[PDB]
Paper text:
In most cells, the bulk of ATP, the principal source of cellular energy, is synthesized by ATP synthase. This molecular generator couples ion flow across membranes with the addition of inorganic phosphate (Pi) to ADP thereby generating ATP. Like the analogous complexes in other kingdoms, it is based on two reversible motors, termed F1 and Fo, connected by central and peripheral stalks. In vivo, subunit ε is believed to change conformation in an ATP-dependent manner to prevent rotation of the complex thereby conserving ATP when its concentration is low.
Three different conformations of the complex were identified using 3D classification in RELION. Three of the four classes containing 104,510 (State 1), 67,829 (State 2) and 53,587 (State 3) particles were movie-refined and post-processed in RELION producing maps at 7.4, 7.8, 8.5 Å, respectively. State 1 was further processed using masked classification with residual signal subtraction with a mask created by removing parts of the detergent micelle. Three out of the four classes from this classification containing 95,345 particles were combined and refined to generate the final 6.9 Å map. In all three rotational states of the E. coli F-ATPase, the εCTD had an extended conformation, albeit with a different proportion of particles observed at each state (46%, 30% and 24%), suggesting State one to be the lowest energy. All three reconstructions showed the complex in its autoinhibited state, with clear density for the εCTD extending deep into the central cavity of the F1 enzyme. To ascertain the enzymatic state of the F1 motor, we generated a difference density map between the cryo-EM density and our built model. Remarkably, clear peaks were seen at the nucleotide binding pockets, indicating that the non-catalytic binding sites in subunit α contained nucleotide, as well as the ‘closed’ αβ heterodimer. These were modeled as ATP and ADP respectively based on known orientations of these nucleotides from high-resolution crystal structures. Once a complete model was built of the highest resolution map, this was docked and refined to the other two maps to create three models.
Numbering used by the authors:
A (entry chain K): 46 to 127, 140 to 268
B (entry chain M), E (entry chain N), F (entry chain O), G (entry chain P), H (entry chain Q), I (entry chain R), ...: 3 to 77
C (entry chain I): 2 to 53
D (entry chain H): 1 to 69
């Protein structure tokens, strides 16, 4: 399944690269040019923590950092020239790990805190408040689906964006247009990844505050 | 033919006109963020997260329109 | 990614995190903490000594 | 109706003082009354008698020459 | 064919144009929240719940439009 | 066929476009509630009931549009 | 058939789009009532009757639209 | 048949969409009356007659639209 | 038949939608008159004639639309 | 027949909808004139000529629309 | 015939609806000029040239619409 | 014939209606420039470049619409 | 033929009308930037980045509309 299996292979490779690069450069050096940046990441990540802060701080902190790292993999395909069947269903694959992991995440806070021991009680006087079950139920379902809908929607929006900018650039015989698009699209991409970490933080600060 | 023609017309209708509402609404929010921060600079870290929440909720209404557009084009 | 390639790709992510925590977080968290403890330390010493 | 901390004062003379929990007075630019719980603000008001409910339901119209309250 | 073509055109019409009203309306509310908090920061926990109530009521009008759209597409 | 096609097109038209007016109007009211309470916090229990009355009257105009939509779909 | 199809399309057109004007207009008035009472609480019994008069006059314009809609559906 | 179908579609078009302008415009005026009286209560008997004049002039534009609608339905 | 059907559809289109602009515009002017007189009552005899001039110029744009409508209906 | 029907529909479309922009725009200007003169009465002879210039430029955009309408009706 | 009918309908569509944007936009600018000069009369020779630049840029958007209209009518 | 007729109708649709957004948006910006300079004349060389940037970004949205129009007319 | 005609009509519909929302929304933001900087010049480096973020988010809604337009024209 080249156009398929080759794709999952690709995204898997990126994720591994994240894993090893972590401990490897982390034992060293960083050093200082490197150290200071690591400070931006970790410390800005701490300011971000406050807000959700303590609950997932190891769990979510490690995660979001890994999310920037793994998220850069798409920038790599954009960075390539700056032909597929890695990155199409490797991008679908990332949308699946991320969005699937998000549906998983609602549960992970659910059991991790109540939250979910209390989430079964979500109906509550809230379904009585608001006395109709249609309101509370449509709301909660729209929430669980909506978390997946939002996160997956962002993921696929990103992957698709990659595919499209790629198309515009590659088909055209004239290079200049492809360049301007690709540069603008590149700023776009970086913004998108940071926006992703922010989105994880948004779902998470949700979780701390959510119910 | 008639069903295919109807899909392409329907895709144009649902994609463009509804998405105008967030094009305006995302801008309304950022104008409020800029005016609020200009009037009171110390309130920046309090209202910036509100602006992001609000922009994403406004952007979700077009993403619904775009979703129907893509269903009509490709589903 | 017709079947199963997406699966492999995602597992690489989950395990990637676990490896970070076990190894990086030991190497990363601790290796990075040196500047925190350090700047914090020299400053603290300065303040206390000046005050007393 | 007495409020919490209220006084009508000039350095020359404090006109009234203590709390007034209701005050009918015509703002220079708009309608004015007093009632607790409104937010802090500053204004001036045209001259005239200001009828204000004060403590133990004391209420009186107090002629303003107008000025910044 | 004609009935199927009419469904796809109708789905585009009801989905996109009505949803513009909340795209704008959700943004109007968040702009009021941002401007109100910038003018008076102590009123944040009082008006934030009002903003959520109000955003959800505005978002329900498009969800009605989207509901008719989905009925036309899939019912 | 032609009558059935006309019903589905008519349902899309009446459902979506008119409901934009409350999507905006419900939001206009909540923005006034938030701005009024931010300017004068003591007036909250006086104007909150006004906001509810007003939101329901604005929401009734789309519910009329939705009613015609449902008649066209199911009556 | 063609006349009946035209009735159902016409009913959708006249019902939904015109009623947006009061959905917005009823809300504009209540926002003015809330903002006016927040700025000057003593003026509440003077301007509340004005708000009711004004809401009913704005609501009459859609009721005209709805009337034409019902004539097309049932007359 | 075609002429009769055109009458019913035309009646829907002219009745609903134009009447939105007064639904909004009657409300704009009453919002100005409420805000003007809240700011300066002594000006009530001066501006109330202005509001009535102005509401009637705005309401005449839809009554023109409604007139064309009724001509198409019944003339 | 086709030409007659086109006349009745065209009459509905030109009559209703354009007349919304004065329904709004006549109201905008009267709101300015009411707010200007509330802020400064002594300026009433100066700005009332301006309001009349301005209302008539705004009302002339729909009267153009209505003129085309009547030409299509009766010419 | 088809060309003649298209002329009458096109005349309705171009005449009515575009002329809404000046119906609103002429009113926006006169509202600015009234509010500016109410705030500062001594500036009346300076800004009245500006209002006339501005009203005529806004009115020229519909007169373009009306011109196309008349070409379609009579040319 | 069908191509000629499409030209006349297309000319009406592109001429009227887009030109509403400058009818409003030219007026928005002149309202800003009038309000700015009323608030600060000494700034008149500075902002009058800005108003002319801005009016011409807004008027160019309809002139584009009118250009397409004339191409459809006469090209 | 049908494809050519569709091109000319599509050119009218995409050219005129979307270009209204900058006709309004270019004017909104120049009104902000005029009002900002009237309130604070010393800020003129700071905000004039902002106005130019902003006008060009707003004008690019119609130029997209015009581009599609020209593709439909000539491509 | 019918499918190709539907593509060209759909391209015009989705390209032009939705892009009006950013033409307005990009301008709303720059007007807020200009007014905020005029009121408080020291806040320029804080709010300029907000304006850029906000303009790009508003511009993305039309770029979605344009994307559907180009798919209809060339895909």
């Amino acid at each position: 399944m080249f156009f398929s299996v080759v794709l999952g292979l690709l995204f898997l490779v990126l994720f591994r690269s994240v894993a090893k690069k972590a401990t490897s450069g982390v034992p060293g050096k960083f050093q200082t040019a490197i150290e200071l940046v690591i400070g931006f990441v970790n410390g800005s990540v701490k300011d971000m923590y406050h807000g959700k802060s303590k609950l997932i701080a190891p769990l979510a902190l490690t995660i979001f950092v890994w999310v920037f790292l793994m998220n850069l993999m798409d920038l790599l395909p954009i960075d390539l020239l700056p032909r597929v069947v890695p990155s199409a269903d490797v991008n679908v694959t990332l949308s699946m790990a991320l969005g699937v992991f998000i549906l998983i995440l609602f549960y992970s806070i659910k059991m991790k805190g109540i939250g979910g021991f209390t989430k079964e009680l979500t109906l509550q006087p809230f379904n009585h408040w608001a006395f109709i079950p249609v309101n509370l139920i449509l709301e909660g379902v729209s929430l669980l689906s909506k978390p997946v809908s939002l996160g997956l929607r962002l993921f696929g929006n990103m992957y698709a964006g990659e595919l499209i900018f790629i198309l515009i650039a590659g088909l055209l015989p004239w290079w200049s247009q492809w360049i301007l698009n690709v540069p603008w699209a590149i700023f776009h991409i970086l913004i998108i990844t940071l926006q992703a970490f922010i989105f994880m933080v948004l779902t998470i600060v949700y979780l701390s505050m959510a119910s | 033919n008639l069903n295919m023609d109807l899909l392409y017309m329907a895709a144009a209708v649902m994609m463009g006109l509804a998405a105008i509402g967030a094009a305006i609404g995302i801008g309304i929010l950022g104008g409020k963020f800029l005016e609020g921060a200009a009037r009171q600079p110390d309130l920046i870290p309090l209202l910036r997260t509100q602006f992001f929440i609000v922009m994403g909720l406004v952007d979700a209404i077009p993403m619904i329109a775009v979703g129907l557009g893509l269903y009509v084009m490709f589903a | 990614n017709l079947n199963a390639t997406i699966l492999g790709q995602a597992i690489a992510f989950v395990l990637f995190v676990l490896f970070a925590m076990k190894y990086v977080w030991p190497p990363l968290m601790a290796a990075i903490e040196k500047r925190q403890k350090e700047i914090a330390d020299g400053l603290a010493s300065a303040e206390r000594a000046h005050k007393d | 109706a007495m409020t919490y901390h209220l006084d009508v004062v000039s350095a020359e003379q404090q006109m009234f003082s203590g709390l007034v929990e209701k005050i009918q007075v015509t703002g220079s630019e708009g309608e004015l009354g007093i009632y607790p719980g409104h937010a802090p603000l500053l204004t001036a008001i045209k001259p005239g008698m200001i009828r204000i409910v004060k403590q133990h339901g004391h209420e009186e119209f107090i002629y303003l020459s107008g000025g910044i309250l």
